[PDB]
Design a protein around this ligand. Structure first.
Ligand code: FDE
Ligand code: FDE
Ligand code: FDE
Ligand code: FDE
Lengths: 452, 455, 451, 454
């Protein structure tokens, strides 16, 4: 011990729990970090956690020999419909390392080449929908990104077609997922989960899990009707220590896991980029420039997607400022001291506020709020563990290459084919589920009249 | 001659445990037993045991003068909620032989005739439900068998009505109970029962045992109040052991009540469920039993006598329990130092595991056509070799409810054949749910009512 | 400081039945995958530990702690390869002796003289493929065996095997290949005295006679009417003890060199060519490099050192399937390996090179993909992560020579032909003690470039 | 199964107190443990505790995320003269962490090398004393062990010479300390702290704290009269807490000395006395032990390295403290509400008592030969289950002095076998003296010198 850790305003037996009684919890934790600094204690009725925001402390917390991935209270609630899936499993749980080693092949750079084609299929549907709009209309950006990202993960991953672009009120599954995800966040604020007022909520949630298990558990049977896809790797892959493939119910947990994490992270990710592009018109220019120069075929090639360097940089700079999955949690593998100042008991919890990490002024310089993609011209100059939008270590985001490819591909095609107007002067408003997307974001797009 | 025993792949300090890190250990120990042969050593961190697969070795192990019933690690974990009840007590502990002797009267034939009435009650309810289904509806068999057996044991044993058929969601008591058995199973494989993944499991486990104890304490209240009662339960209360004179302490009563509920409802559901599977997949066998049904059940409701007629139905049930004994294994320890089968020396106290499924697949005893389902193997039961067919355990520690069960399945299985035709409308691939017991999972059928009325 | 994993045990026969296959090395890889970076492998009367991670492999290559061990495998090769360079103890008298007598033959200096005869053999192969009719095809490992054997026989010993003038394999190659087949098979044998194996032993005894009768033929053809590997054996004297090699040891070095070269380099070329037809972008990328640099009818020593992508292809092939897949080490004194595994002095280690070359922590998550671009900055490669040629003073003396031969040959093949995997060949790895693809066939269309 | 806790007979408003109105409670609680099994509740007027006997439950009770060290009612009374010394302080008491991180350097293996020389000196005095005995004279083992352990802790700890071997009548200092412990233990057992029967006690107790504080301030003053030793005492005067203050205040130091002196001389002597008991009672072991001493103690005086090489001797000592842990118990409280062993709910703050002697007798862990003295159990010390053997406590509050004590027991016991043959000439029946620590009462032997010189 040397240093007593700061802690924000406390409400008697309710601790600092009321501090996140916003619809914007993450943003509130930022507002607290901005005033209390690199670390602060955050107490709830049944739990206590420490939030880290400086690259200095995060570098220590990302030591895989001292800390492991913890299930935050948030992820504990997602465990009720995502169960034992990669995102919500403990490292030492039996299905993590099992599922982790079988699936890494399906997201290696080699796997992308196969996903590329179906990736494009959904990508044209989006382009066609925008081309077919009449002039007086506009684009509802998050909604169309959700349509795309879900149809892409559903098609490329499992060869199931959601056909979101053929419907206006969202898919029952997606509406159920979002309402299930919303319930997980809504619980965080209940200091009385037994209270009867939450019976309709507990009812609806239970009905929503049935909706997901319905479609998904049908899909596992609907394929036993084999191609080379994510589901086939799950049905056919073998674990070398017991020799068994994945549990039938565990697969149901992974599919649910992959559908949500992809559709929620990637759609938010694309939306944020587009905001920054229409708000930074010169960056928009140079980005459409490379887009026009590289996207030389009626359809993109896998090689060409890699040859977008500035579109990728806008993507990196977007996820820096608003990382769509804003936080991960860790626990102390053993007793240890953090930053030489804060001692930790075995089992103590840490929360990394990725947005606040990504604003650490000593690391990125004093223009941390400016959208300047050229910070990524020399990616090796960026310090180890200063930029962790995909988590850390073995528990790092398994789909970051799939995601980058999709975002790069789609963003490239958008820049080739349209010019974008911030016709309403949209002020950035962040919707918070557990993930982050912008809300009501709308643009108008004038077609560059180019065929596919 | 004194030959060393095979042992499968071993890891670090955690020994052979990762080999059995599945949701279907018995099916895995089988696929291991098939690989290593009749006997192999299986070490887990801090415990050592031998798994047996040949009748040759089992005949030696069923000598009650050399081996006594041992509590497997599995049973040590169910003892966490079944305590020293009949299933999970040491045969030398005081409460075993006390309870064994006070309760044994309640399961001989003479007692069965008394239960027959309420057994039919619960069965008519099942048939009544299957009659009352709409045309394109289906039957979830394991789930409806679960409703049946729990309703049957609780009424015959305890004059308590679960009224499971009056529910869609399983009785909450069953939900907790199944998760408790599932937890005992999972605790077997835990590579580190410490680290935090397992803290909610601790929560759930205790929460579920409390659930079971409450309705048990409600059954005991329901009787302190409600009667001319020839029960498992009256023999438990008023019954006195004729050797030391006293009756059961309350705690042991509670463990016996839970014990009886669980074992009946789990093994007997699995049995009937499997029986239907093999019948629907071998239709001439279904035909053969389906006429024994029509031929013997000539009154609107079966009589006790009619159940013993159904010889083939018993034969069907036997061949099913042979293939998948729902209690797939029992454990033994060496009373003293010995050599097993002349090849393997063992120190006193070494534990043995009988993989009843693997015994029941022995080719030297059953022939080369084992895995085929032919109920005709059980027609001269005296022709069946001694110690080759042990689905009901062994010796004085054998299943006390064997005849009650055989009577139960045959009656229920008989009526099902009398009143319905069964369609495997899904071409169901067999999926064995493994708690500690076995039973088919997701098994569904369609049933055509033969439109015969009931009483 | 922890206990080591171990595969399935069969009582008194220990782990021995696990390698009662025809492909033990590939079988040790499957075991490694289930048990990880280290596992104990016991047979009755023998114990060894298999290592798979660069983390532990870096330790086992510390030459102050561990020395080259003769695995049970090499001990059987010693029955016809004796005290030759490969099957010698580091302390044996003839090792250090022969090492210094022979090292002059593998310096860069020596290579430049060999290049002329190396080209000779390569032209024979090209002439043979060009002279094929349209419907015909190439049996790849067989033609690589014709090449490599003729090549070392020419450079090392100025002896012409004239393999390309034959349809039936060379008798030497047959006896020699089953001598390795027997050495490998003797390893898994539970009952070595049984009448089942009596015919194998007459046959083994006969294979050694065939090999020695040819070696005796080579020496007389020289002692007839040349600054080569053989003269250095006959005339060279050890600067440390003063004497040349005994006649006995000469026989073993000749046998050793013919076998080691022809077997490892046959496998290498075949695997390289295998990967080339399976990754056609690499085929194209490498195909052009030949045309750009190999501009004269026959390559110059300098030109081959310029074929860099080709060299990279070759390196990426020996990374995936190292033709000598293992070497063994023993602990010089009591020690602890990796802070986890205490070792008494004399305990044996086995380096499973194919599994080492798959350590993702070093090579990344795409280890199984054939990507020669990993070897652009070879200095970027961590030490002890890429060890196809062994380690330290006991490392392969014929290393740079092989790379030269493989590159010379691989380039000319790319210069002069286009190859079709007309069979969609599935990779089948034959195992003696070395590795080799077995049923590999392709078609080649001549580019009509003359020689 | 979430079980009702057994509890022995309760006597009116006096609860279970009449059950321990004996002179040997630990020995009695073992008897209770045997009838009621692995756990029972024990209530006294104002106290409730749960006594644990099984490895099953102890494995849970030593989880430091659930339980913290409690001041047992005993330790609450010892605190009356040990104050906030290391033994009788709460973990959250400021001075505990302060003293712990300041003093831990004095028990590192780095430190034993320094203590070894002075440890030997006291040990030689013991050898010389036994050698210079006349033929009829026998040896009273515990009394000599006390002389040894106290002279050694004072010399190593504080560079102060008690010179106990120059006395036959006990130190005024030690009799006061021994009587203070005996009183704290007995004041635990009294129904009425009001009765006039206890006035002489209340007089003597307050008088004995007076002597202890006297002698201790002499030690703290005698070093000022010197200014140069690198010992426990210099570490207390010079060590500063790396946490927020600098040095140890002069009052807590007054308590660390009392704590160390008492903790060493009572546990470490009783341990040695016990080690000798089993050796004279199991001659096969003694033969084996002398064997090892004769081979290893190859210098006229033993060296620090040689001591490490005395394995079997370490085995017997470990086997002795297993059978009779001289500090027989420690106490724990619940940091929050929890369930113990899945059966017994505990409210936050509820107290537990670990009966180290009964745990070291758990058949499931050690086998059915619990009572027989077989030092061969400890040749694979890493094979022994975790938390089945806790003679030096548990966790952050485990005995700081294990390293040193074992160094003493090995050193002293080793020479005894080097230089003497031992006869239980009286056929001594084991009688266990119980203060808060344990110790044989009246153990006597005769020793024949092997005539080996130094
Ligand atoms: C499919 C997919 C897609 C995606 C995307 C994404 C984006 C854009 C972003 C992101 C992120 C992330 N992730 Fe992500 N993702 C995914 C996924 C995933 C999974 C499965 C996971 C888990 C793995 C492990 O760790 O185990 C993740 C994971 C992840 C993470 C971590 C978590 C924790 O808690 O630690 C993060 C931070 N992810 N992400
Ligand atoms: C009620 C009931 C019913 C039944 C059924 C049955 C079926 C179906 C099958 C069976 C089985 C069996 N069991 Fe059975 N069961 C019963 C029961 C029982 C009991 C109580 C027991 C224990 C007994 C004694 O002896 O104690 C049994 C028991 C039994 C056994 C053995 C166990 C041991 O561990 O040894 C077996 C194997 N079971 N099981
Ligand atoms: C001639 C020749 C050729 C060759 C080639 C080759 C290839 C391709 C690959 C290889 C390899 C090798 N090698 Fe080799 N090679 C040779 C050789 C040799 C010799 C002689 C040896 C031994 C040396 C010494 O040191 O002694 C070798 C050696 C060698 C090795 C080592 C082994 C042990 O045991 O350790 C290895 C790993 N190799 N290799
Ligand atoms: C000097 C010294 C010496 C010694 C020794 C001994 C022997 C022989 C035995 C013993 C023991 C013991 N400890 Fe002992 N010791 C000592 C000490 C001590 C101290 C200071 C303590 C407290 C610590 C803390 O941190 O808290 C102890 C501590 C101790 C313990 C714990 C108890 C409680 O409270 O928990 C035990 C059981 N110890 N011990």
């Amino acid at each position: 011990t040397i240093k007593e850790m700061p802690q924000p305003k406390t409400f008697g037996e309710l601790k600092n729990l009321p501090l996140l009684n916003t619809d914007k919890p993450v943003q509130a934790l930022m507002k607290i970090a901005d005033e209390l600094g690199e670390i602060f204690k955050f107490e709830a009725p049944g739990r206590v956690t420490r939030y880290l925001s400086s690259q200095r402390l995060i570098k220590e917390a990302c030591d895989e020999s001292r800390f492991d991935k913890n299930l935050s209270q948030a992820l504990k609630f997602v465990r009720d419909f995502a169960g034992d899936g990669l995102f919500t499993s403990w490292t030492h749980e039996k299905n993590w390392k099992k599922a982790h080693n079988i699936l890494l092949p399906s997201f290696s750079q080699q796997a992308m080449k196969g996903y590329h084609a179906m990736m494009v299929d959904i990508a044209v549907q989006l382009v066609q929908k925008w081309e077919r709009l009449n002039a007086d209309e506009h684009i509802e950006v998050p909604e169309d990104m959700t349509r795309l990202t879900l149809d892409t993960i559903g098609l490329c991953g499992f060869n199931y077609r959601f056909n979101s672009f053929y419907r206006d009120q969202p898919h029952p599954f997606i509406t159920s997922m979002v309402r299930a995800l919303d319930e997980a966040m809504n619980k965080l604020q209940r200091a009385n989960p037994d209270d009867p007022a939450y019976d309709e909520n507990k009812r609806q949630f239970q009905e929503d899990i049935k909706v997901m298990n319905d479609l998904v558990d049908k899909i596992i049977a609907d394929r036993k009707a084999q191609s080379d896809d994510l589901l086939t790797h799950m049905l056919n892959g073998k674990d070398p220590e017991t020799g068994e493939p994945l549990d039938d119910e565990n697969i149901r947990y992974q599919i649910i896991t992959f559908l949500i994490a992809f559709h929620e992270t990637v759609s938010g990710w694309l939306s944020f980029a587009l905001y920054f592009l229409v708000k930074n018109p010169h960056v928009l220019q140079k980005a459409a420039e490379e887009a026009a120069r590289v996207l030389v075929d009626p359809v993109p090639s896998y090689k060409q997607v890699k040859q977008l360097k500035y579109v990728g940089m806008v993507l990196n700079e977007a996820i820096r400022l608003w990382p769509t999955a804003p936080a991960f949690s860790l626990y102390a593998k053993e007793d240890t001291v953090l930053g030489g100042e804060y001692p930790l008991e075995k089992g103590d919890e840490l929360m990394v506020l990725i947005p606040q990490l990504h604003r650490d002024k000593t690391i990125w310089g004093d223009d941390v709020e400016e959208f300047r993609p050229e910070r990524f011209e020399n990616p090796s100059a960026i310090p180890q563990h200063a930029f962790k939008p995909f988590g850390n270590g073995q528990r790092a985001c398994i789909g970051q290459q799939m995601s980058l490819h999709e975002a790069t591909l789609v963003l490239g095609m958008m820049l080739k084919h349209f010019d974008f107007e911030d016709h309403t002067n949209y002020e950035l408003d962040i919707k918070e589920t557990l993930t982050l997307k912008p809300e009501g974001f709308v643009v108008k797009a004038k077609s560059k009249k180019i065929p596919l």
